[PDB]
Structures are given as structure tokens and as C-alpha cells.
């Protein structure tokens, strides 16, 4: 029942002898070639560009704190940048970070010299980490620092950046304290700012371009993340696959999810309108969300498959008529030497003859096939 059209005709007729005529056996159907999803562009893209290339960062003891939510955070801009040399980040891979979707994002931005860039890490102990900014042990954030000796450090030493060097206790994870209570030690007689075993807990280190790389200031940003304990508000971008025309392809324009062939349409659309429908409530044209133009959609070519044959006693040669389809997409029959086209459909295995005779096997649109010398 699948060897050849004559066998298909025999199976459909449920008989081993097939009389002269045309018999519809199967249904032609062109399968979709691929799937294209042309999703729209960015809805709300609040970037980290101003967070990273800011005018000036805040002091490390009172760092710059930012909340990112209800956005589409593009991590690709951070990923493609090679200026970052300390991408010491956990929980998520940089390439899959765009795919990852989290409820909240916390941006902790400040300036740290190269000596204690190591100290910006979970489970790390040090004076800077314990006095200015500490990372939680269950750290899912993303730590990114880059050189800023040409930007932050100035001639004669820079003193606008302040850090805490003295404190009785250690900072709990993600704790900020700008009160800067006076450091006390020994017998603690220091009521004021200076005294025995007394010093100002806040201090400033001169930043110079000619200073050592370890003492050179770096701009450092921590992107603290959190798990999906709630519906997500900040997420990644979507797909932007290419469009293919004059090919039967499943398409997805703004969730249309329709299957057909795409062509450039002469019909006009109003600016607010996004797709058109037929008189039978079937979609027939779609406006592309990415680029504002109209694409006419028509259903994948299909139709009956008929076998035109003389009596099996006369001959076993057959012809195949694919009804209502142009022969270009018919192969998507073995006897491809002669393939003729008529209003009825595509006829394969029979040759056109200029001469006209009495109809023997009608095909359609005033054309008949016959078995002759």
C-alpha cells in the first residue's frame, strides 16, 4: 500500500484489478520546513550602564545601593565587555545569566584598591571586608571589578574616597553603618576624636597613577541575586530569529503561532493594528512586530493525490495528479522527466500533446488523460 501509486490505487480500491480512470488515493501535505519566532523588542530595558560607568562611585563604608526590579536586565552588555578582569561570580554562569530569571537584583557599587579585591568574596576574612562591606556566605550575587587608576586616582593623592580601618567588632553580612563612632581602646579615656589608643575609624588613602597596582583603585560592583520565591519582575530578553519568505515555515509573530507560507503583502495596515483576519475568522496577514511591515500568510499547500491509469490489464503505467498545487513544491514522484501543470493541478508521468481527442480519463479544467501510442 506504499510501494507505488498503482499499488496505492489497488489498496484504496480493495481490488487487485484497477479499471481505466482516475482514482483519488491519498492526501498531499507539505510539512513545515522550520519554526521562526520574531518576538518584539525590549519593553523596559533599565541598564547597568549608569551604575557601572557612573560619574563617581560612593565610599566603600557607605556604598552605592541600587534596587533593580520590574525590568528587563540585559546581562549581555556585561558579558561582552572584556574590561572586567575580576568576574568572580557564583550561582549562575555568565552566558546563562540572561536566561536566568530572578525576583530582585541588588547593586552594591564602590571603589576598592587591588590589594583587597580578593576580600570581596563569600567566606573571606579581612579588615576591609569586616569593616566596610561583607558578603553573605550563601552568596548568589555576581562580583565584577575593573581598573580605574586612570579615572579615580589624581595627582598628589585622592582623598574623596573614605574607608574604615578601625572597629571593635566585625560587620555582619551586608551591613552599612555611617555613624562612624570613635574608636576606643585600652583605658578608653578618649571622649573626643584623639586620645590614648584612640583614632578616627575613618581614613583616606592617597590614590596616585604612579602608585603600585595593588594600591590602585578599582571600580567594583556586586550584583546580589535571590532565588525564585515569588513571581519574577526583572528578567532577560527574548528570541529574535530571522524571517524567511516564500517558504512554508511555522511562524510566531507576537504569539500568533500560525503555520503557512509568508509573502510581502500589498494590503495596508493601520498603525495600531497588528494582524488581519479573513471573512471566515482565519488569520491571513500579520504585521511583523520587530520591523513594521505586513506579511501575507497563506496555508501550506495541500490537496488530493489522484492516480490516472488505464486498465491494469492494458498496462501498469500510471500518472499522478496532485490537485491544486504548483509543481515547484510538489517533490517537497519518481518519473520527474515530464511534469506538466494545469489548472486542475500538477500532473506527473504524462506528456502534453497539442492534438485534442475525445475525453477518456477526465482530469479537470477541460483536460483529459489517455493511454495511447
Amino acid at each position, epitope marked *: 500500500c506504499a510501494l507505488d501509486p498503482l499499488s496505492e490505487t489497488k489498496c484504496t480500491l480493495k481490488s487487485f484489478t484497477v479499471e481505466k480512470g482516475i482514482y483519488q488515493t491519498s492526501n498531499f501535505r507539505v510539512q513545515p520546513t522550520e519554526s521562526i519566532v520574531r518576538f518584539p523588542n525590549i519593553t523596559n530595558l533599565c541598564p547597568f550602564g549608569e551604575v557601572f560607568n557612573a560619574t563617581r562611585f560612593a565610599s566603600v563604608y557607605a556604598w552605592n545601593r541600587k534596587r533593580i526590579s520590574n525590568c528587563v536586565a540585559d546581562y549581555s552588555v556585561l*558579558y561582552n565587555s*572584556a574590561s*572586567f*578582569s*575580576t*568576574f*568572580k*561570580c*557564583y*550561582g*549562575v*554562569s*555568565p*552566558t*546563562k545569566l540572561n536566561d536566568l530569571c530572578f525576583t530582585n537584583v541588588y547593586a552594591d557599587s564602590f571603589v576598592i584598591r587591588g590589594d583587597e579585591v*580578593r576580600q570581596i*568574596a*563569600p*567566606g*573571606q*576574612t579581612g579588615k576591609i571586608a569586616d569593616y566596610n562591606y561583607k558578603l553573605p*556566605d*550563601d*552568596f548568589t550575587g555576581c562580583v565584577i571589578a575593573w581598573n580605574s587608576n586612570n579615572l579615580d586616582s589624581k595627582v598628589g593623592g585622592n582623598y574623596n574616597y573614605l574607608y574604615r580601618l578601625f572597629r571593635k567588632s566585625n560587620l555582619k553580612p551586608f551591613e552599612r553603618d555611617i555613624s562612624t563612632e570613635i574608636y576606643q581602646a585600652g583605658s578608653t579615656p578618649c571622649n573626643g576624636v584623639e586620645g590614648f589608643n584612640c583614632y578616627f575609624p575613618l581614613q583616606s588613602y592617597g590614590f596616585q597613577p604612579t602608585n603600585g597596582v595593588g594600591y590602585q583603585p578599582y571600580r567594583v560592583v556586586v550584583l546580589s541575586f535571590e532565588l525564585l520565591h515569588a513571581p519574577a519582575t526583572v528578567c532577560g530578553p527574548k528570541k529574535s530569529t530571522n524571517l524567511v519568505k516564500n517558504k512554508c515555515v511555522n511562524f510566531n509573530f507576537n504569539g500568533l503561532t500560525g503555520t503557512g507560507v509568508l509573502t510581502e503583502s500589498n494590503k495596508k495596515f493601520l498603525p495600531f493594528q497588528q494582524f488581519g483576519r479573513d471573512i471566515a475568522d482565519t488569520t491571513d496577514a500579520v504585521r511583523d512586530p520587530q520591523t513594521l511591515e505586513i506579511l501575507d500568510i497563506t496555508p501550506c499547500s495541500f490537496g488530493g493525490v489522484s492516480v490516472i491509469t488505464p486498465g491494469t490489464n492494458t498496462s501498469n503505467q500510471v500518472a499522478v495528479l496532485y490537485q491544486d498545487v504548483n509543481c515547484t513544491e510538489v517533490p517537497v514522484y519518481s518519473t520527474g522527466s515530464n511534469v506538466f501543470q494545469t489548472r486542475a493541478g500538477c500532473l506527473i508521468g504524462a506528456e502534453h500533446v497539442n492534438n485534442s481527442y475525445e475525453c477518456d480519463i477526465p482530469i479537470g479544467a477541460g483536460i483529459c488523460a489517455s493511454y495511447q501510442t
Partner: antibody
Amino acid sequence: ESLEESGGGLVQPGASLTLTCKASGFSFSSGYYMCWVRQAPGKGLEWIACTSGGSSQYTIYANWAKGRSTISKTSSTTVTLQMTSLTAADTATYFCARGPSTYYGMDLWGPGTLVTVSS
Amino acid sequence: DVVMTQTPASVSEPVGGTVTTKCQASQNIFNNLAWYQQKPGQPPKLLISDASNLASGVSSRFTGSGSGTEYTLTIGDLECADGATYYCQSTSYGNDDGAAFGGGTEVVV
């Protein structure tokens, strides 16, 4: 400091083995990762898995041993890793090395133990 | 998991020469590399970390450079004791990138 391994040796094919690494002079704080690597007798190093120290239970497996290894921290000083469905290709030398949370290289490598999968 | 492709597999250099080893990744690692030297019968010893930093007790002859996806290790003034196998490894512990090593590279004096 120092790192030591125990629980290796001869293991029958198709069985399961358990290997333990015990530290001396420090603790498995959240600032250090306990990682496992293997070395074929005449080939290079093949990474196995890691587990974050401290209260964190975060754990990363390799692609080849995602379903055949189980790495977890039993104590602040001892760690354990288990192999399943041992084959002759798994005959290698296991090294217990620590990795700082700063994402530097592994320092203070253990001497290593040899595991043989034969009958 | 990122893979390390380390070439050449075998290299031979005279005494006092320079030998260069290339390591390539499948994705961008943003440094986080470690170069190791392993002598026969000995566990691997760290030489270079962060692809540019040298640890304590490491001679200045070893020098690492590179960024992005391509990394280089060079050893100047080769000595008789330098004959060993050198490895490159990513240091992504909890980043899902893994820490797979590359093909070992033996050096011949």
C-alpha cells in the same frame, strides 16, 4: 596545612566506592571549596566535582560524572565522595585539593590515593 | 561545562630557552585560570593563578598572559628540573562552568 585521603584501593567492577578527604590545621570555611580531581595512570587531570564550604550546600558536578558521583560535606574537617557503577576506565589517582573562594588556583594538594577497578 | 584545549601535546626546548603553551576555552572565562606543573610521582603544584598572578615561592621565569578565550603560558631560562607536565584549568567553583583540565603538555629538556 595538609590534606589526606582514605578509603581507596581495590574495588570490584560494578560496585560502589566511598572516598574521604580529611584536613589538618584548618576548617572547611565558606571561603574555601572542596574539589575532587582524577588522573589516569598515563593521562592528564580530569575534574570531578566541588562543594562549597561553610553553611552553604551549593555543589557543582562535572558533565561526565553528573549522575555517577555524590559529593557532600559530612563535617567541617572531613568530606566524602561516592562513585557508582565503576568501570575499568575509572582506574585513576584521586587528588583532594582546596580552592579559595577568591577563584584563585588550587593550593595545598593532597598526596593522592590510587583506586583500581579490577577483579 | 567549559572544556580546555591545550596545545602542543609534546614540546622540546634546549636549556635556557623559552617554551610557550596555549590554552583555549569554549566560552569566555574572564581570567579565572590556573597553570600547574606536575612532576612524575608528585601531586600537581600551583604556578600561576588569575592568568597573571604568581604565588609565593614561584620564580619570575614563569609568566602568564592573555584574556578572553585565549591564554598563554611562557617559561624562560629552562632548567633541568623544569621537565614536567603543564596543565591549564578554569577556576569556576560554583559557576556551572566547571573546572575541567586540558590536555597535559610534557616538556623535554
